[PDB]
Each structure stands twice: as structure tokens, then as C-alpha cells.
């Protein structure tokens, strides 16, 4: 069937535009990464990684 | 002619076959807030009164 | 389960399950002590025999 | 990451959630019970009129 969307219809019957973003947040190789800057590497020193 | 707030009219619904899905046609129904029973599991129950 | 949708059925079932586990632990906790006391009495009986 | 885009009626906005049924969520588009991500729904009566 087909909805009839008209400006006369009250609020609630007006069409709404929806977009959903689905992620894959788990331990897996990265493909998309946010804004961050890389840095150097150190070894045999108690540091935060 | 819905009655005033200080004198609200109580309507009792007797034995019938209620279908809590045709409501969306009569009024816009922007929000459907429920306490206890959820509107999802609403068409498959039997009520006392 | 029939009256409520899964989204909050999860939290309700969480409450029920944590309550019933808390109830169940006390039973074995007391059973261990009673078994220890009975074992002491049994050792005394074996010595008497 | 995936982006899914479409347009619905206003009364069916609440139906796009885990563990919901009805018309849109049972015959057209179903979300998993453990969906992780974001949804964005907004009015578009300016265009669809």
C-alpha cells in the first residue's frame, strides 16, 4: 500500500526521515579510526599503551 | 465535548473483543506511554474490567 | 514474559534471578556446617564403638 | 560500519528498537535484540508534502 502524506495531516502522520549507524565494536582489525595522532614506541618500560 | 478536568467522565467497557491497534487511525497518537503492560504485548491478553 | 517485552524483561529477570541465587546460597552454606557437626558426632560414635 | 537509510511514518518511530513487533518491525525491517550503534530520526514535512 502507500501512505498519503499531505501538509494537512496532523503531527504524527507526517513522514519522518530515519538513518541508523551500525558498528562492529569488538576485538578485530581496524578499518575506520577516529581523530588521533600516532607516536613513537618504547620497550622495557612501564608505560600506558 | 470532552468534559472538564475537575469533573471527568468515567466510561466502563464491558465484555467485548478489544483490539488495541485501531487507535492509531482515530487520533494522531504521537506518544503511547504505558506502565506495567507494554504496548507490544497488548493484543494477546484477557482483562478483568 | 507474556505481559512484558524483552527490553525490560531483561532487568526484571535480573532482579528475580539475583534474588533466587541469594536465596539458594544460604541453603548450602548452612548444610556445610550441619554436615561438619554430624561428622564430628559420627567420629565420636566410631570411637565409642 | 554501515549506514541504513529510509523514511517511515511518525507513529512507527518507537517501533525501531530491539525486541519490538507490529507492522513495520515484523514485516518490513527487524533489528536484533543486541543492536549497538545509533539511530537518527527527524521531521521532513518541508520536503515530503
Do A and C touch, 3+ Cβ pairs within 8 Å? The answer is: no
CA distances from C46 to C32, C33, C35 (A): 21, 20, 16
B26 interfacial to chain A (CB closer than 8 Å): no
Chain B CB contacts of A10 below 8 Å: 28
| CA atoms of A44 and A32, how far apart (whole Å) | 30
Distance (Å) from the alpha carbon of C12 to chain D's nearest alpha carbon: 15
| CA atoms of C26 and C34, how far apart (whole Å) | 12
φ/ψ bin of D22: left (φ > 0), alpha (ψ from -120 to 50), beta (otherwise): left
**Which residues on chain A place their C-beta less than 8 Å from a C-beta of chain D?**
3, 5-7, 11-25, 32
Distance (Å) from the alpha carbon of C26 to chain D's nearest alpha carbon: 34
- Report CB contact under 8 Å: D21, B40: yes
| CA atoms of D35 and B25, how far apart (whole Å) | 30
Structural element, H or E, at residue A19 = strand A15-22
Q: In which residue are the cell numbers 535484540 written?
A: D33
| CA atoms of D13 and D41, how far apart (whole Å) | 8
- Report CB contact under 8 Å: B40, D11: no
Angle at B45 between CA B43 and CA B49, to 5 degrees: 110
**Contact in structure between D25 and A43 (CB atoms under 8 Å):** no
Find the distance separating the first CA and the last CA of chain B, reported in whole Å: 25
Residue of B23, B30, B31 to mutate, testing the A interface (most A Cβ within 10 Å of its Cβ): B30
The data reach a resolution, in angstroms, of: 3.6
**How far is C-alpha A25 from the chain's CA centre?**
10
Chain B CB contacts of C2 below 8 Å: 41, 44-45
- Cβ atoms < 10 Å from Cβ of A14: 19
Q: How was this structure determined?
A: cryo-EM
φ, ψ of residue C10 to 5 degrees: the values are -60, -50
Residue of D nearest to C9 (CA): D19
Amino acid at each position: 500500500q502507500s501512505y498519503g502524506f499531505r501538509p494537512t495531516y496532523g503531527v504524527g502522520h507526517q513522514p519522518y526521515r530515519v538513518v541508523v549507524l551500525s558498528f562492529e565494536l569488538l576485538h578485530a582489525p581496524a578499518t575506520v579510526c577516529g581523530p588521533k595522532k600516532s607516536t613513537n614506541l618504547v620497550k622495557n618500560k612501564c608505560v600506558n599503551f | 465535548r470532552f468534559a472538564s478536568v475537575y469533573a471527568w467522565n468515567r466510561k466502563r467497557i464491558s465484555n467485548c473483543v478489544a483490539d488495541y491497534s485501531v487507535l492509531y487511525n482515530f487520533a494522531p497518537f504521537f506518544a503511547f506511554k504505558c506502565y506495567g503492560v507494554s504496548p507490544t504485548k497488548l493484543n494477546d491478553l484477557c482483562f478483568t474490567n | 514474559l507474556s505481559r512484558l517485552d524483552p527490553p525490560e524483561a531483561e532487568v526484571q529477570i535480573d532482579r528475580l534471578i539475583t534474588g533466587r541465587l541469594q536465596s539458594l546460597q544460604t541453603y548450602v552454606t548452612q548444610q556445610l556446617i550441619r554436615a561438619a557437626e554430624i561428622r564430628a558426632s559420627a567420629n565420636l560414635a566410631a570411637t565409642k564403638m | 560500519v554501515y549506514a541504513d537509510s529510509f523514511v517511515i511514518r511518525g507513529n512507527e518511530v518507537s517501533q525501531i528498537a530491539p525486541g519490538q513487533t507490529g507492522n513495520i518491525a515484523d514485516y518490513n525491517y527487524k533489528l536484533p535484540d543486541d543492536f549497538t550503534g545509533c539511530v537518527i530520526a527527524w521531521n521532513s514535512n518541508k520536503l515530503d508534502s
